Ligand binder design. Structure first.
Ligand SMILES: [Ca+2]
Ligand SMILES: [Ca+2]
Ligand SMILES: [Ca+2]
Length: 424
DNA sequence: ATGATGACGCT
DNA sequence: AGCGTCAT
């Protein structure tokens, strides 16, 4: 019987990363309730990142700034840079590369988003294990680590108590014990996080466990600027009252149908179903994955990949701003094509690859899906005017309008994705 | 009128 | 190829 303790995997999360970037640049924003906003005009701007001081007053992501200031009147706002009429996230993409380069010195990392990376510590841990002459692990090597499920009046008091219980029972004589291995992973993640902070001023959270889903769950248990070790043995207690929708990839329609088809609420309850039963309800792939997951077993690998596989540029045109003339459809395409070329040229010189395919996506008024339609064409020159002309060429026939100069039904979204990279 | 992106599965 | 799901 396999237990999914082959690997040591971590998820590192830059807590409210865009806010940290702005608070490093503007010291007057540090240790204050504050948030980062996109587009000041409509209701003060849509909030895309919130410091923990502001989260205490109820300010959340996607809330309008004008509504946020009702919950939190002293809230400081930093504004996202705008280029060619759209939000430009270049400042944060650069900072994110800063952090992942430091992370790369410690283990192999998979960029999960601008602010999160998975980390495969298996080889790093094995190496570090030979280097420790069977020596004990000091609690002073784990100054921000929580041990989930432990211990069994002061918050710092609880943490150390749990950690001392953990360390006391540790079997340092067995170089293949998965609990010892997780502990060494956790010392390394402490080291990687002290270096990120030392070399960028950014703080981050982490979770350490045996796979990606446990690492991501562990990461969210103690935030901010804290890390959590979730061992294989903590899983049954942890899953016993864990809502299904908190497990990675179960927050959407699949999760809700697990809840509804099976009549359960919590991840642990999935253990009473056979793998064939789960496969018959959710399909061979989903059932196998579920069967193992509710037991803390998951095999999705940490892909060694710091660089995205698509480079894309989108802008929404909601409400009355939706595009309705051929003229303005062509101008935004041009605006979108131009920011895309800057990014592509920076990527050709920075990462020695060239993209070869161009995906144009649009969304129409009334349709409530992300994309209404997706068409592709070749990407031969990094030239904004060719790319916009070709993007337009590829979507023209969607215009059902009669008047030449008009576009119906209005476009609420324009999207240009460069993909199918190749070595250059 | 929760945006701008990104990864991936299915057919 | 083109659409759907899940996520930050
Ligand atoms: Ca928003
Ligand atoms: Ca944590
Ligand atoms: Ca899956």
């Amino acid at each position: 019987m396999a237990t999914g303790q082959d690997r040591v995997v971590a998820l590192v999360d830059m807590d409210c990363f865009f806010v940290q970037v702005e608070q490093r640049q503007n010291p007057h924003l540090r240790n204050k309730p504050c948030a980062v906003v996109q587009y000041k005009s409509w209701k003060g701007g849509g909030i895309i990142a919130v410091s923990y001081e502001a989260r205490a007053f109820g300010v959340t992501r996607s809330m309008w700034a004008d509504d946020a200031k009702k919950l939190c009147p002293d809230l400081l706002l930093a504004q996202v840079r705008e280029s060619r009429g759209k939000a430009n996230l270049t400042k944060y993409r650069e900072a994110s590369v800063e952090v992942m380069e430091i992370m790369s010195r410690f283990a192999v990392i998979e960029r999960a988003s601008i602010d999160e990376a998975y980390v495969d510590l298996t080889s790093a841990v094995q190496e570090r294990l030979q280097k420790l002459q069977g020596q004990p692990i000091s609690a002073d090597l784990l100054p921000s680590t929580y041990i989930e499920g432990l211990p069994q009046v002061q918050k710092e008091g609880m943490r150390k108590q749990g950690l001392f219980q953990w360390l006391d029972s540790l079997q340092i004589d067995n170089l293949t014990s998965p609990d010892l291995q997780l502990t060494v992973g956790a010392v390394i993640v402490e080291e990687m996080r002290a270096a990120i902070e030392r070399e960028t001023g950014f703080q981050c959270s982490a979770g350490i466990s045996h796979n990606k889903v446990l690492a991501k769950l562990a990461c969210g248990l103690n935030k901010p600027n804290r890390q959590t070790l979730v061992s294989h043995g903590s899983v049954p207690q942890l899953f016993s009252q864990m809502p299904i929708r908190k497990i990675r990839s179960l927050g959407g329609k699949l999760g809700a149908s697990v809840i509804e088809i099976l009549g359960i609420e919590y991840m642990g309850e999935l253990t009473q179903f056979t793998e064939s039963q789960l496969q018959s309800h959710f399909g061979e792939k989903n059932g196998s994955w579920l069967y193992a997951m509710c037991r803390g077993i998951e095999h999705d690998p940490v892909k060694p990949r710091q660089l995205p596989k698509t480079i894309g540029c989108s802008k929404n045109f909601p409400g009355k701003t939706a595009l309705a003339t051929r003229e303005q459809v062509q101008w935004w395409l041009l605006q979108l094509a131009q920011e895309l070329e800057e990014r592509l040229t920076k990527d050709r010189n920075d990462n020695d690859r060239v993209a070869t395919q161009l995906v144009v996506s649009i969304r129409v008024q009334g349709d409530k899906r992300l994309s209404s339609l997706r068409r592709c064409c070749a990407l031969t020159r990094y030239d904004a005017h060719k790319m916009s002309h070709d993007a337009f060429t590829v979507i023209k026939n969607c215009n059902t309008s009669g008047i030449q100069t008009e576009w119906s039904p209005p476009l609420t979204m324009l999207f240009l994705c460069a993909t199918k990279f190749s070595a250059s």
